[PDB]
């Protein structure tokens, strides 16, 4: 079961190993677009959190699922932020959701009082007000039920066939990270020019025992110009200084 484009589902993924290979190697994923990240590199990265949003929409309507797009969905049902980093995965669902003159459970909002904000979600289905006349019950021009169903008929073409979509939103700052990929750790090397990959931060330099008092809530240290001056090991939590060879 997948939710409608309005009142879409949201699942938080944290504290686990993300094996994106089993996700990419799926056949029915006919559309797989990522922003700010390449699918081949997902297995080597680590994020601070992951949010999976799922819903069903028309076929060509999937073009509205992208940063800064315009349209019914992108404006009143589900809007992605301009700085979105993640992936949008879609696959056909005619064998699952389509019914001849049926499948009313999938709906979308046609109009709204104002444009929906990024990652917003309006659970209520109150009737839009027309203004020129009082509207307490059902009414005409502007006071129609805001939701209307797709009614996925198998006779419809690809332009109106049901497509199942799930958007993977990744937060990619450097705060406590917990969704790293299947990469394997390696014994630490100190006092030698070594290439390091600390919880996703990749660089080169010599690692030395730190002498600065990191507070228990801090995980990284920076000099002028965002230069990472220190880092704490995600395994033994010891603070290490980074100096260019």
């Amino acid at each position, epitope marked *: 079961r997948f939710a*409608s484009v309005y009142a879409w589902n949201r699942k938080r993924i944290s504290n686990c190993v993300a094996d994106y290979s089993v996700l990419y190697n799926f056949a029915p994923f006919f559309a797989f677009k990522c922003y700010g990240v390449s699918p081949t590199k997902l297995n080597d990265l680590c994020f601070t959190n992951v949010y999976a949003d799922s819903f069903v929409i028309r076929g060509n309507e999937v073009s509205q699922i992208a940063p800064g797009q315009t349209g019914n969905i992108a404006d009143y049902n589900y809007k992605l932020p301009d700085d979105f980093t993640g992936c949008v995965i879609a696959w056909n669902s005619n064998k699952l959701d389509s019914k001849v*003159g049926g499948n009313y459970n999938y709906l979308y909002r046609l109009f709204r009082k104002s444009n929906l904000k990024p990652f917003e979600r309006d659970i209520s289905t109150e009737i839009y007000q027309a203004g020129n006349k009082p509207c307490n019950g059902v009414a005409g021009f502007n006071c129609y039920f805001p*939701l209307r169903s797709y009614g996925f008929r198998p006779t419809y073409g690809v332009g109106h066939q049901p497509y199942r979509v799930v958007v993977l939103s990744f937060e990619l700052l450097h705060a406590p990270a917990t969704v790293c990929g299947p990469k394997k750790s390696t014994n630490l090397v100190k006092n030698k020019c070594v290439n390091f990959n600390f919880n996703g931060l990749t660089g080169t330099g010599v690692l030395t025992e730190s002498n600065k008092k990191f507070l228990p809530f801090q995980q990284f240290g920076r000099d002028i110009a965002d230069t990472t001056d220190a880092v704490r090991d995600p395994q033994t939590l010891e603070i290490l200084d980074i100096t260019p060879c």
Partner: antibody
Amino acid sequence: QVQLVQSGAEVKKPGSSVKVSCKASGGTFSSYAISWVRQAPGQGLEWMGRIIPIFGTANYAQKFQGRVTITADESTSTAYMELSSLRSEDTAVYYCASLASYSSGWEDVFDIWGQGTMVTVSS
Amino acid sequence: DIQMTQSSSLSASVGDRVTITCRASQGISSWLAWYQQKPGKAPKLLIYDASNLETGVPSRFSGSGSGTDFTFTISSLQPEDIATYYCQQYDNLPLTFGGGTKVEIKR
């Protein structure tokens, strides 16, 4: 919270038309969808049709079209059912249930059911 | 058209495990439900998704299967299980129900 109530029992002659309805109590008529299902003596449940009062979309079973007609409104907030040219075999109990497949990713199951309307045909 | 066949009458004593299946001619996409019903009364919905129970029914009732098969199961019978159960298909618009399996308390 949602609950349904049906009409009383009825008895009429063969070949005539029988009218029956169910009140769309609880919730709202806009957030509700009704569907009629037949249960004959010695048989399981059998579909008659579905109606969404707010969308106005309706359909029937492939063996009861014309013979069965479905209608609904909001002023009374009820689904109207009319069965024309009823046979003597049409002696059965009709049910009016909630159609969950109407909204929010639910599916075509009936979470709320009414009592039941017994329609009998005899001379 | 799509149809099904429950397989018709059962008898069991409190505590034992019973299983029932409703076969079909074409693979239902896990769109199958099961109801509890006294013969000639308003049914009560128990299973609507193949692996999700509704609110109000205890975990004693269960179900399994996918595709062109399904199996409804009661982990243990109790005196309240004197009723018939109906397998329902909702893969397409022409809704159809099963004949109804009836399990009787066994003395």
